[PDB]
Amino acid sequence: GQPLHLPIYATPADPKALLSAAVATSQGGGKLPESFISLWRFPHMLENA
């Protein structure tokens, strides 16, 4: 009962290549607040800022 033919040999499966996706988002920029005038002249307000 030993077969004369030799058995066929299986081919192993292909492994999966794990891949990541890196995307970026776009947040909208902020606008300016309102111009509020003050009492001070230029150099004092400049140094303060």
Add this chain to the structure above:
Amino acid sequence: EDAHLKQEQRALEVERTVSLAQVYQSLGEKSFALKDKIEALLQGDKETS
């Protein structure tokens, strides 16, 4: 400090002279001239005011 800079304003600076002879003279009808009454109230050693 930002709340101060918002609430900062230009001030109006008014001087005023108060003459006490006019003040004690111009009153209700229980009024008096300042010089003579101070002279009498300091001269006399009485209760009077």
